[PDB]
């Protein structure tokens, strides 16, 4: 369970589920969720847009863009070994952590649920190539191989 | 079962190295289907 209030969410989670849903419990917890939501889905904008109205605002902004590009190039999860069972890898500086799909569980998704089926239905991006040298129109380029 | 009990550890042995001993005696560990032997150590030694 994610989001809600511990009393009610606890109650729900403790429900083994032999019955399925204890509708009372679930409704109460949903009320809790109204009292304390959790973030589910979102549209990101880059933080650098915010850096505004500060001394040297523009210089810091552009430095920060440069740093963000170096940071992504250094710590993008594309460099992880691939997770099992369609785990999406995520990298927290020093370790890749696998986000398991629903119907996959264990520490890093290695055991599937009985219904998962779908064996070796896979695919995720590789890392960017380094930039090509400047071409005839002095454009550099790079590629990523879905591999 | 009677459990063993240490008697008091000896005086410090005169310095050529330093040592003490415990006879495990004060209550005998073996009598009456004697219980646990005493704790270790029975003998303790040190630099002076």
């Amino acid at each position: 369970i994610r989001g809600g209030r511990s009393e009610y969410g606890a109650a729900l989670a403790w429900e083994k589920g032999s019955s399925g849903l204890e509708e009372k419990t679930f409704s109460e917890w949903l009320e809790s969720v109204k009292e304390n939501p959790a973030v589910i889905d979102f549209e990101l904008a880059p933080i650098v847009d915010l850096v505004r109205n500060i001394p040297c605002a523009v210089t810091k902004r552009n430095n920060l863009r440069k740093a963000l590009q170096e940071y992504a190039a250094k710590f993008d999860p594309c460099q992880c070994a691939p997770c099992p069972n369609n785990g999406r890898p995520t990298l927290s500086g020093t370790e890749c952590l696998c986000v398991c799909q629903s119907g996959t569980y264990g520490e890093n998704c290695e055991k599937q649920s009985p219904d998962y089926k779908s064996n070796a239905v896979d695919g995720q991006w590789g890392c960017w190539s380094s930039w090509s040298t400047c071409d005839a129109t002095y454009k550099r380029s790079r590629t990523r191989e879905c591999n | 079962p009677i459990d063993g009990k240490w008697n008091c550890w000896s005086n410090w042995s005169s310095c050529s190295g330093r040592r003490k001993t415990r006879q495990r005696q004060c209550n005998n560990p073996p009598p009456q289907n004697g219980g646990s032997p005493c704790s270790g150590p029975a003998s303790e030694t040190l630099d002076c």
Binding site: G3, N36, P37 | -
Partner: protein, 177 residues
């Protein structure tokens, strides 16, 4: 298995002498660790010698333009008479301070319900939490209210903590064999 009695190594050579104490120290390593209940090593792993130091004891640089807490920590003079004890243990920034000069710095002072534990140190070998290392309740003269949707109550965050949030996760693992 057999107990293995612990045996001390020889002493290392002495440390350089501390100019603040005029004492040297040398450590006695453990040659063989006591194992399987083998008797632990007996006596101190250290001994101390007096000396003549070659090096002098470094003095405190005082607070200069900053306010000095009685301990010797320094804080911004803007914090004096906040009505908040911005000196950690001493509250010296709040000595002889008039209640006519004390501003109502914030509505509330209740920290989140166990925030002090975030201040603690940790011993990564033993897995034990250890003693308080960070002051988790320096409010910095801010009134940084957060409303805990869990406790349904307002708490005062410190001025410096990056984030503190109260959304819940619950995980249940249940096994019959």
């Amino acid at each position: 298995s057999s107990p293995v009695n612990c045996q001390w190594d020889f002493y290392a050579p002495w440390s350089e002498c501390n100019g603040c104490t005029k004492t040297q120290t040398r450590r006695r390593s453990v040659a063989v660790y006591g194992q399987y209940g083998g008797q632990p090593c007996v006596g101190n792993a250290f001994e101390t010698q007096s000396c003549e130091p070659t090096r002098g004891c470094p003095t405190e640089e005082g607070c200069g333009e900053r306010f000095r807490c009685f301990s010797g920590q320094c804080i911004s003079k803007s914090l004096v008479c906040n009505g908040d004890s911005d000196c950690d243990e001493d509250s010296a920034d709040e000595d002889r301070c008039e209640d006519s000069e004390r501003r109502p710095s914030c509505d509330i002072d209740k920290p989140p319900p166990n925030i002090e534990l975030t201040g603690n140190g940790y011993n990564e070998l033993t897995g034990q939490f250890r003693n308080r290392v960070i002051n988790t309740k320096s409010f910095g003269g801010q009134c940084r209210k957060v409303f805990s949707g869990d406790g349904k109550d307002f708490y005062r965050l410190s001025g410096n903590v990056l984030s503190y949030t109260f959304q819940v996760k619950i995980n249940n693992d249940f096994n019959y064999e």
